[PDB]
Amino acid sequence: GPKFPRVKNWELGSITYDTLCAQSQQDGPCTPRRCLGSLVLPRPAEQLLSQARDFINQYYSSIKRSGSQAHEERLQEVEAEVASTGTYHLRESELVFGAKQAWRNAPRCVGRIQWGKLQVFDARDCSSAQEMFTYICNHIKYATNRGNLRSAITVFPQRAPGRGDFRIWNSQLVRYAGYRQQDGSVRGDPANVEITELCIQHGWTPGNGRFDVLPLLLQAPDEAPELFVLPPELVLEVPLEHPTLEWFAALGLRWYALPAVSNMLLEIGGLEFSAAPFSGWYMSTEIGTRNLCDPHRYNILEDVAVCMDLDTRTTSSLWKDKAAVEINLAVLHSFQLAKVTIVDHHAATVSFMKHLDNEQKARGGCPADWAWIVPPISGSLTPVFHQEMVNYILSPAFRYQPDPW
């Protein structure tokens, strides 16, 4: 056969070869001697220019003007810019293309069937924390759209050599506070204890609920981060109820509509956008299974199973499984009731399979992180479980970056 990874779908028996991986200009953490594909985290003008040239080539390919005069002119314009400044700047349409391509290229995102439909907000003119806040508020308003969620990304100015970064300190635009208690337990989201304490140290009067929306800690270059409280009316939340378990509503659970990652680095052509929050809509298991049922998160599995009167004293009763299913159903039912976009893990994974087929034809493959694409409940009940996947890093890319503090 061909010398490219052979990729099998075990449910269907179909075979594809990934040739796209040939485009990867960046090494992952795996070697022939060991696979580290389950690790969450991994671990100069000449370099910039090659990355720039490569991106400009991608861009001109995408507009079908590869090799053209404008392509060569743009390439030269970029070299000369890097020549005199040590950096360069993207044209608006390049930024739009690059942002979309970074999403398209994101191995961990199951939502990529939507990749061509991304509203890119250019906020590269932003010059203060206050303006960052306005742009973020605007983003949230646009993306939330009163429950009819729209994918969006707001791109703040790129890392500039000699100058400090724009950084959103929160990992998400909307996340709930986590308050460490005397007993050592946490009220709210344990994931967010550190950022919550930073909000308080920076002047935020903290609530004491399990679902207090965190304020934004926004950092303009070479300034201390500034604190901005999101106006409650901008943050759409959904009270959780269950379609058949009437008591479920009395748990007082809720989640926010808008999943917006705010601390990833968007890298395009060697340029680094350290603040480029993007948002899509939730896949229900992100909330139902991970946020609400993770032992290190809200960890509500036992609470719900007890209310369901399950035998929580034995693993074989599958109480964790029964309760998790009902929480997930409650999440779906409540978002649907509240008319807030949400996709269940079956619809999401079916759409990702369609995406894989599209991308096979468009690009000869699709980088995908199986561990992340397969949902955290009902894994093999979704088609992606049976789909071998090849993981590799393509640029443009979203990258994790260390917390600014």
Place this chain on the structure above:
Amino acid sequence: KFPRVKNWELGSITYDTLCAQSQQDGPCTPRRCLGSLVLPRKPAEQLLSQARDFINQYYSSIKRSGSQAHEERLQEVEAEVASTGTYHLRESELVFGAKQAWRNAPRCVGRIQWGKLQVFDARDCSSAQEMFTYICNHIKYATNRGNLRSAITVFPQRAPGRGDFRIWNSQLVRYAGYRQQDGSVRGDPANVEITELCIQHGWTPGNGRFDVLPLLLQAPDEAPELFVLPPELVLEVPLEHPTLEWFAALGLRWYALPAVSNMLLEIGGLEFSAAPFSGWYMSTEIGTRNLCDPHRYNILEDVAVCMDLDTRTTSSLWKDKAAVEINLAVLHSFQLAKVTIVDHHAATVSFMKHLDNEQKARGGCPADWAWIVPPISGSLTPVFHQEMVNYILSPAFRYQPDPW
């Protein structure tokens, strides 16, 4: 560099140093990870070094390393490879090698049990008939009236001058799959090809959904021979649900003994092409994969309809709900039948314990996260939150191509 391995639920970090012991390459490269792939895409000195390495492991295990009998045994192996191009394991070494292959098996969640393995030396087997007798004893021993006991039976090693001893079945016990005229399959669609091979080799087919296949056993360079397992040897569990009284009427059942019969056991450079092993089931293998996979018995919709769920839409999570009840039925029924089974919560918890032991014992543990994390309720189990390093240690079980 040693991979830093974090558990995201507990925040604890380990470093895998064991992976440095890997002498065999997996499918990954820095350019791309192929960790989700089920199968791999594809002389005296090398054998001698694998042999020496293994003998060294063996003598280190009985803490007689560098000793006398150690050096004699290394000498024996060297003299035998030098003159014959191969060598033979002492039974004690074979026993050690098999347990170690199990211990090293990245996809096995049952490895807490690795030290308790009954090893049957069937290397004195000269015919398919004798293989069948060994296999029958294996099954009897392993099944043990439902009190399942891990076992492996090791048939003669591969030899350069001849065909392999092979069991053609992928499992000792598996159900037939009969391709119907209308393209559908009665029974297990996973077994259509082996079912057809059995028929072509003269088996009279049943037409049930759960007809236990006969064994196609191949002695070297001979046509495979067909042997029917004595039904009394094949313990089966009718599946009923503890609360859904209609579930038993589905007529579903599964066999007690999960026994892989087509993997190659490699020990010290020697390859055992037939070395069927068995443990006991983790419920999700049956409830979720065997019964609910779309390309297997695919019973999700039937159960969901019997549960009277809204089957028309994904958002009702009928699949998830049905799957849970099926797994619950499997556990209840095996527990009712007094047949050893482990649920995926118990199994993954014990596996975490095993990871801890192995971290202390050997500085790591090869683990294939995609396989260790159960097919349902992944993140509800501790292994989901556990980063794992996957690599090939020897002794090893490896896949091998189907003999036909």
